[PDB]
Design a protein around this ligand. Structure first.
Ligand SMILES: [Hg+2]
Ligand SMILES: [Hg+2]
Lengths: 299, 299
């Protein structure tokens, strides 16, 4: 009853590995149309055959596959997610299992000792606005959509090249011929714009904790005041905590505690982070229940 | 809905690691009586405090703990299993997370390319028997209980010393003064006993696959025929497969596919394994539903 849960929790390496190594020679793709026996399977693989059997079972146990009749096997609609289609939730497993991630997390205890594009932002409403300045835009994803959205508003970007700086045919492509106003360089530089509203997308997500404080020191040391600082982020459940859903926040906090930087602040951990770093709270507003996406907005 | 399952399956490293590193400075033990705040907690640990918070959460998410009021935390009856009491299901996590196990499984894909004591055996019934010979006994666990059980039956063992060979005060301790008849050495040696019944406990469990064949070649090349070869084992679901329970077999197969040797044969994979290795099937009989423990018995 309870042990069941604990083991199931404690045996995560098993569960984790088996899926990666199933898509590793994309097993599902063989069974998308259909494939039977371990023998027909083992031809188009390499590996062992009667010690590959010991994996088909493991999959079938984890419910990703299902042997309908003795030996011979099919796959489940969960196992449908692993082909490279609609979701293609297998790139996910591939990166979360190669030594880059899987071997890194092995010694993660020590660290405890030591293409998104919001039209959600068209519920903030830039509906009396002339200028904006996207801080560390990079791709030209929002910038496009937002200056596309509001035909009279204009804008600016600043990111170093070699940080997804393929703006070339994206601020240009799709209408915004004027209103690129593009700059270069880091966010660690004191930002020369003093022009209406300021936008920072899923960016503490990238940052550390007092990295966030000093990149926001670099704004209000020469922000044009009496205007709005937007920052869109994933938050962390200050709502309460719970089990179901939520998840993504928790084990991406620890993922980025290992795989590069990122940590997750709650509501109040942004309020105090702003109040000392020269910013003043105002309203906050999330996405619907399926996500944690939150448009923060302090003055 | 489904993604939920897949992620939950694919994110096993997270789940796996967090529990080990919670008992690693036995957090639960602090909260068995009671402990509050991250600050009182962090004194009796080391580590960080506001980057230890990022773990308490993770535990509380995985439901092992539960923060009742802002910050301050308690633990759950699942988290009760991790202290070192009744079950003490934390030694489990400690060995399944240190580099010996956790780092070993990291590259386990390649391998795919390349104190129990049955009174259950007092349902086989030695109830017309005089002699027995426990093959590779070692500890003197059954030998004791069984020659203790039946006052007139007598027996023998053979195991190399330095393989839990603390028989000294166990065949002796608890009544069986006579009927030790103890020998030494490997099972790879041709076994000199030709004396009634032969017993092999959870031993393919230890073995490989054709290691099993030749250690049973070493029996019938000089077994006294017309008698019974007992071997007690964990089987593998030839019943069907399923999800709930079962589990232990599946991810101990792969555990021993990494952590030393062991693989799991089903019913028919023992029948053919015996039929060529000079043994003849007869009855099989398991433990109840909670386990897979099976007393095989071929003539
Ligand atoms: Hg990664
Ligand atoms: Hg181990």
């Amino acid at each position: 009853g309870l042990r069941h849960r604990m083991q199931q929790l404690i045996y995560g390496f098993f569960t984790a590995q088996t899926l990666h190594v199933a898509v590793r020679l994309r097993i599902p793709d063989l069974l998308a149309d259909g494939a039977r026996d371990v023998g027909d399977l083992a031809s188009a693989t390499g590996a062992d055959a009667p010690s590959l059997r010991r994996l088909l079972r493991a999959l079938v146990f984890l419910e990703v596959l299902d042997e309908p009749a003795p030996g011979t096997f099919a796959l489940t609609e969960q196992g449908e997610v692993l082909r490279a289609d609609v979701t293609g939730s297998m790139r996910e497993l591939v990166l979360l299992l190669s030594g880059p991630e899987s071997w890194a997390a092995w010694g993660q205890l020590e660290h405890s000792v030591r293409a998104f594009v919001p039209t959600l932002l068209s519920a903030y409403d830039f509906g009396d606005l002339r200028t904006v300045v996207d801080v560390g835009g990079g791709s030209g994803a929002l910038l496009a959509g937002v200056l596309a959205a509001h035909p009279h508003l204009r804008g600016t970007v600043f990111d170093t090249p070699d940080g997804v700086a393929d703006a070339a045919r994206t601020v240009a492509e799709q209408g915004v011929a004027d209103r690129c106003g593009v700059e270069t360089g880091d966010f660690f530089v004191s930002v020369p714009p003093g022009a209406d509203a300021y936008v920072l997308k899923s960016v503490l997500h990238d940052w550390d904790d007092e990295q966030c404080v000093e990149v926001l020191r670099t704004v209000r040391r020469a922000v044009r005041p009496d205007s709005r600082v937007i920052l869109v982020e994933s938050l962390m459940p200050t709502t309460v905590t719970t089990a179901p859903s939520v998840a993504q926040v928790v084990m991406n906090d620890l993922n980025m505690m290992v795989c590069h930087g990122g940590r997750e602040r709650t509501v109040a951990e942004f309020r105090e982070l702003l109040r000392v770093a020269g910013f003043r709270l105002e309203s906050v507003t999330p996405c619907p229940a399926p996500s944690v996406v939150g448009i923060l907005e302090a003055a």
